[PDB]
Amino acid sequence: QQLVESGGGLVQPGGSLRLSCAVSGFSLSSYTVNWVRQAPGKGLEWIGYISYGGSAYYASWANGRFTISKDSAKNSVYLQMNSLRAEDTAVYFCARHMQVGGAPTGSMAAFDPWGPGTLVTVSSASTKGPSVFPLAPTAALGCLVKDYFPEPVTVSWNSGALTSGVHTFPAVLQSSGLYSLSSVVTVPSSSLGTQTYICNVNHKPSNTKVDKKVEP
Amino acid sequence: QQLVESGGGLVQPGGSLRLSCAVSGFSLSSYTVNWVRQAPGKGLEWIGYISYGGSAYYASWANGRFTISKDSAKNSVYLQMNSLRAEDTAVYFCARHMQVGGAPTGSMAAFDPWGPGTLVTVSSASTKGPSVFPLAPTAALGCLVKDYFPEPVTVSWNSGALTSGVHTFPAVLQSSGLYSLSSVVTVPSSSLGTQTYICNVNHKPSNTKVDKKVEP
Amino acid sequence: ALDAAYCFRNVQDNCCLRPLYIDFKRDLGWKWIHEPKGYNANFCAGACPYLWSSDTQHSRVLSLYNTINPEASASPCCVSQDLEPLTILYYIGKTPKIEQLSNMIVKSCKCS
Amino acid sequence: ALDAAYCFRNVQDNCCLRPLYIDFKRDLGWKWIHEPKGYNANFCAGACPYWSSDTQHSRVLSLYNTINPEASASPCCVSQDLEPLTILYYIGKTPKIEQLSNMIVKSCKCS
Amino acid sequence: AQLTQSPSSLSASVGDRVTITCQSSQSVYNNNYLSWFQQKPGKPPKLLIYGASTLTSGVPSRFSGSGSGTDFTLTISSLQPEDFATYYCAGGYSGSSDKYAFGGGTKVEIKRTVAAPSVFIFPPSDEQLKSGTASVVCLLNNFYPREAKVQWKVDNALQSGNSQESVTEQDSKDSTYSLSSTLTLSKADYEKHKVYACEVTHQGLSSPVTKSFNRGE
Amino acid sequence: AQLTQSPSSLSASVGDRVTITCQSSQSVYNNNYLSWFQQKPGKPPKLLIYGASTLTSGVPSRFSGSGSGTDFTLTISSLQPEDFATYYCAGGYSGSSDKYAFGGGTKVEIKRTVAAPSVFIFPPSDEQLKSSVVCLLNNFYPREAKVQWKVDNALQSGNSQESVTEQDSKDSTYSLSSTLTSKADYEKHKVYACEVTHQGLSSP
Structure with missing residues (x-):
């Protein structure tokens, strides 16, 4: 019982996107699958679903701009949206009905499991990779990811071994139209030199994968 | 009777794309529609069709990578390809069957009308845009359209109102990874300056529309 | 009703009777029929929107259900409803003989 | 044959019977049946590849689409055999009991 | 609905x-x-x-x-x-x-109980100086409540309209916050000034706390 | 099949x-x-x-x-x-x-009756220099030609790009273009000339 959506990313207005949702551990002929979406910072909104029995129902505002469909042989569910708008920038979630459908008791408006979501940005701007700079001096240090569009970035520390004491900040939109972000970490005054520290930043849209190394 | 393709551009290796043929003078419940593609400088290649009666058949090498579909209320047919390898860079046409289906006599492997084609570029890559430098002087002149991506790019000459001596050259892939071309026009040795010899390059995957004045 | 009387004179994209002619020899390889060389089998195809075609009790209940319940079941598609036999003529030797094949002609469609 | 016995055993994505219970008042707004409160109605659903050849027509189409370069219809998973259901109501202060025809689907076909 | x-x-x-x-x-x-x-x-x-x-x-x-x-x-x-x-x-x-x-x-x-921020101040790295712009980061780590003022001073003079903040979602375990204030300057305009100071006012601090440095360590 | x-x-x-x-x-x-x-x-x-x-x-x-x-x-x-x-x-x-x-x-x-290319030299703009010159043979047959550039009396097998038309629908004539683009080396050089070994023309 696991769902993973894919196909998100950067597409400009009026264009079309097809997101996909790979299912595993349950059958598309038993479970109804929904698409939920979230504007950055706003609440979840139900797009629609494709039911166990194969019937697609939508929310009022879709107005036929979205078609939700499935393919049981390829194990997946599709949400395709035409003539895209800026207000369609959102994380897109693949949410499964909790219970198998058609039984005497239903799912009672419950959804579980859910997918990690995938970000869909709509914009005219062009993918720029990030510049990665060192933030260098119990003491703290980190990395300054700067100038990148669209979101997101994955900032991890020393391959994810170093996890406690890190704060990856939320990205900020600069006036230039690109985003900026810093991630920081706190370590013992002994360790500086005992161990070395490097951030692994990953901006998937420009396939930029950087490892920077911090130092005084 | 017309067929207008759309949906095309550059797409990331391994991604997905859906194209749409917009059909006009005929009903999709009488005519099959076919999708044939051709690589740059290669032959045509029948990828498959969606029949007047609603059946889809595919070339043997498609292997479930392509799905063909139709909507008669929307007046369109769709070619949905996923997992785009480099190979699949090509122009794509939708071609109608010549004759209605289910008649005592068939179409005889004849396709008519055809669509203009839409280019699809599978590459990691990065959309750029063309710079436009003139080439100045019965004598002749030219515009040079340098460093852009991906293909293709139009060039007219004085609002497309001059159609003699124009030879827009094939585009060539520079060592960088971009493209460039030239277009030149023969014109009387006199009256240059009395007439305004202007070229109007127009790249589309970057929404560029330069109108480069050319004079002595 | 979704019969030839209505569907062959009128242009429609919803679920209707659709013309189709099948040459026995070339389209099936049924070399054993002498006559006729082919026939109008037809088929059923097109969309099923709101109140287009009624079917049984069961189709009505499924569509009501699908409206009243949050987790809709199955959606209807276009199929045959009334079939009709076809009489063909073959030969053993120079001897004629008649067989009535059942359910060879679609004379009407429905949504189910 | 895609009946209740085959299809329930192995949950397949190809055309099959599928279980669907239905409560009269709760799901259709039928408040007049005194009893039963619901029933397994079922439905038909799933992929149909190139045919359930019950009726000669579907055989003919299945074959035509192979030999002809320009195929016709595609199949679809639809009801086949329907059986009634026995109800009970009293709109008239005395016990009634009819058979409601074509209320359950017991088999499915690609067609 | x-x-x-x-x-x-x-x-x-x-x-x-x-x-x-x-x-x-x-x-x-x-x-x-x-x-x-x-x-x-x-x-x-x-x-x-x-x-x-x-x-x-x-x-x-x-x-x-x-x-x-x-x-x-x-x-x-x-x-x-x-x-x-x-x-x-x-x-x-x-x-x-x-x-x-x-x-x-x-x-x-x-x-939760209030907690004063541990303040640090990072100067622009050598890499970034070799471009157009420069970025000075002030970090307030682990503090409650979210109310906190951060003011930049260059050669003691107060700055405006050239910095921006972002604050982490509350910690799941300790319920504290973290803020990052980044001030953006042009390498030219960066050079002209000497003292770079970040002044934090928080309710868990009796008086403001200043952390500062000078270009060239 | x-x-x-x-x-x-x-x-x-x-x-x-x-x-x-x-x-x-x-x-x-x-x-x-x-x-x-x-x-x-x-x-x-x-x-x-x-x-x-x-x-x-x-x-x-x-x-x-x-x-x-x-x-x-x-x-x-x-x-x-x-x-x-x-x-x-x-x-x-x-x-x-x-x-x-x-x-x-x-x-x-x-x-086609063998035909003579009308040759044209084009120098760059004061547009591109603030960051390339072309040789053009026009309306000739057959398709094949050999182009060698020269700037201040040096050939160079370095600007390996040319492209040619598709046969015109009224004359079956052609048109080749060869590229001369890195401004570093261009800045000093002064005299630019072209010479084409075709058949429809006697000597380059």
């Missing part, structure tokens, strides 16, 4: 009971098709309660839902710092459109 | 008659589901002949299809200057895959 949940925002102390309400424009199907979900930032929502009251496996008995028809309540008997999250409610409905819907949200923030 | 076309390329003269043969690995349905298509460069295929031999109305009679079963030929009778194109055959099949299939194409190029 629309749901409205009050309140929009909420802060409460560890151990306090908190209750949220959902209001439906029309009755949910079978009068009890309403779930509750809990979303923490960047993760997908997590279903807590279904059928208006039935709990789910994996979910503490502290949460409990009740209500019916059109009026519902979710209840955390005894709040805890893990519970910082937005809580959404979901309803199911009849009709041939809008089968389900979510309410607007309730952000729950935890309240 | 696949189908093979011969010959892949061919050149002939105005008035001459040309034969293209398509040949199918497997029999085509009804033995006459084979069509023939004209494709100009940068256009969709035009339909010439359906059913192996029928001519599309308004398509000119100098095109004719003959053949059946597995062997088919298209015959262009009185070749025209506007008949330069690539020529494809499509066929229909039985089975549940590859219902239709195209051939490899045949590029037909028209033969």
